[PDB]
């Protein structure tokens, strides 16, 4: 309060929990793009890009650690219920091979006839 | 009293940020400020006759 | 809606050239005016006491 | 009877002889890394936060840039966050990079 009548002293009360953190804003780099309800790995965060973004735009990624229906897998592999899921950022497809890919989830429902999968999302480690 | 007491009061702090489609909103903060203190003295004079 | 409609209009352009008794008269054209576009955003914040 | 007793957002601990915690600050106590909701003294009971939430803090080593996405490691010796990735414990990932005031927003991690 500028020009206040009296020299009052303001004391801050600290507060660590800025937000619930179920989702994270992220900025698109040059070689990245997004469209709605598609999984992406942007700046170390993996989640469901809830909005479209092409170049230097802001998008938000769902990291709720909930259950997600994805498809968009490597169709050749088999995905039994319980198998771990890895995101192959080079191919931009889910896979069970753990060569150099990010661990992102565990399948809850196996690969059906149309390559659909349900899986839990993991805490972004 | 011989010396007064400082006034106290709490204040919330928040800022409205742009909330694009389904993101997490960042919470605010509460803080307190206190007033100053004042005191009162005594004075006296007299005569003898 | 989150993005506002753009107003449109149709305008007919024509120019008078003085005829020389023997030249075909050149014809005008039509141009369309386009309005601006406005967008509505969502702002939000809160406290967690 | 139910196995679940609480949502697990907060966990209680008992301060040791070499530990003392003040309100709303990060402390690694008995393997749990969280934000203490009480000002605790030796042999006292306090409650931490393990909420997997986005957390604000400036208690960082101010030597290296905390660009968004980089993992945040908690150094119990110096009692600071850092991106060293050494034997220090992993605690979170940066959501918003460091500002001129050296303030960090990061997401906590499940204490694995």
A84 contacts chain D (CB < 8 A)? no
| SS3 call for C42 | coil
Interface test with chain A among B20, B25, B34, by most A beta carbons within 10 Å: B20
Question: Is the Cα torsion angle D52, D54, D58, D61 positive or negative in sign?
Answer: positive
Among candidate residues D75, D73, D69, D77, the one with its CA nearest the CA of residue D97 = D69
Q: Which residues contact B30 (CB under 8 A, 6 or more apart)?
A: A13, A15, B10, B11, B12, B13, C47, C49
> Between A and D, how many residue pairs show a Cβ–Cβ distance under 8 A?
68
Per-window interface: C 6-35 vs B, CB < 8 A: none
Question: Which chains border D (3 or more CB–CB pairs < 8 Å)?
Answer: A
Asked whether A64 and A53 are in contact (CB, 8 A), the reply is no
φ, ψ of residue B7 to 5 degrees: the values are -75, 145
- Name the residue facing A21 among D54, D57, D90 (closest C-beta): D54
Sort out which chain A residues have CB atoms less than 8 A from D92's CB and list them: none
What does the DSSP 8-state code read for residue D88? Answer: S
CA distances (Å), B8 to each of A1, A7, A9, B37, D66, in order? 16, 13, 10, 11, 38
Using a CB-CB distance cutoff of 8 angstroms, which residues of chain B are in contact with residue A18? 26-27
Distance separating alpha carbons of residues D38 and D41, to the nearest angstrom = 10
| Method for structure elucidation | cryo-EM
| Record: contact A11-B31, CB cut-off 8 A | yes
- The alpha helices in D1-112, defined as continuous H runs, are none
Instruction: Report the C-alpha gap between D79 and D59 in whole angstroms.
Output: 8
Distance of CA A34 to the CA centre of its chain: 12
Long-range contacts of D95-103 (CB under 8 A, 24+ apart): D95/A21, D95/A24, D95/A25, D95/A45, D95/D54, D95/D68, D96/A25, D96/D68, D97/D65, D97/D66, D97/D67, D97/D68, D98/D60, D98/D65, D98/D66, D101/D58, D102/D58, D102/D60, D102/D62, D103/D56, D103/D57, D103/D58
This PDB structure is determined at a resolution in Å of 3.2
Kindly compute the dihedral angle of the four CA atoms of residues D10, D15, D16, D19, in this order, to the nearest 10 degrees: 100
Sign of CA pseudo-dihedral D48, D53, D59, D65: positive
Residue B27: CB atoms within 10 Å: 19
Determine whether the interchain pair B20/A60 forms a contact, defined as Cβ–Cβ distance below 8 Å.
yes
CB-CB under 8 Å, A25 with B30:
no
- Return the beta strands (E) in A45-97 as ranges: 45-49, 58-62, 67-69, 84-88, 93-95
DSSP state letter for C39: B
Q: Please tell me the distance in Å from B12's CA to the nearest CA on chain C.
A: 8
Query: Distance between CA atoms of D68 and D93, rounded to whole angstroms?
Result: 8
The kind and range of the H/E element at C13 are: strand C8-13
Q: How many residues does chain D have?
A: 112
Using alpha carbons, list the distances in angstroms from residue A15 to A25, A102, B21, D4, D54. Answer: 21, 32, 26, 28, 12
Could you tell me where the beta strands, DSSP code E, fall in chain A?
A: 9-12, 17-19, 23-27, 38-42, 45-49, 58-62, 67-69, 84-88, 93-95, 102-109, 118-121
| Other C-beta atoms lying within 10 Å of the C-beta of residue A105 | 23
Decide if D52 and A21 are in contact by the 8 Å CB cutoff: yes
CA angle A25, D88, D80 (to 5 degrees): 65
Per-residue CA distances from A2 to A6, A8, B7, B10, B15 (Å): 10, 11, 19, 18, 19
d(CA C16, CA D54): 70
Question: Are residues A15 and B32, on separate chains, in Cβ contact within 8 Å?
Answer: no
Residue B40 region by backbone torsions, left for phi larger than 0, else alpha for psi between -120 and 50, else beta: beta
Q: Which residues, numbered 47 to 76 in chain D, qualify as contacts with chain A under a Cβ-Cβ cut-off of 8 Å?
A: 49, 51-57, 68-71
> In angstroms, how far is CA A115 from the centroid of its own chain?
21
Cβ within 8 Å of residue A122, ≥6 positions away: A65, A103, A104, A105, A106
Distance CA A89, CA B9 (A): 53
């Amino acid at each position: 309060f500028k020009g206040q009548p009296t020299p009052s002293t303001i004391t801050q009360i600290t507060r660590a929990k800025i937000s619930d953190g179920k989702s994270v804003r992220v900025i698109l780099s040059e070689g990245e793009s997004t469209k709605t309800q598609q999984f992406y790995l942007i700046n170390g965060f993996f989640g469901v890009a809830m909005q479209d973004g092409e170049k230097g735009d802001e998008v938000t990624l769902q990291i709720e650690q909930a259950e997600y229906e994805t498809d968009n897998i490597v169709t050749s592999e088999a995905f039994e219920a319980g198998k771990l899921i890895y995101w192959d950022n080079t191919a931009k497809k889910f896979t069970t091979t753990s060569a150099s890919n990010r661990l992102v989830g565990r399948v809850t429902d196996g690969k059906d006839s149309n390559n659909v999968i349900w899986f839990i999302l993991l805490p972004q480690q | 009293p011989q010396v007064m007491d400082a006034k106290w009061a709490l204040q919330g702090n928040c800022v409205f940020l742009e909330h694009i489609e389904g993101e997490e909103i960042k919470f605010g903060t509460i803080n307190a400020e206190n007033g100053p203190v004042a005191r009162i003295q005594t004075y006296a004079t007299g005569f003898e006759y």
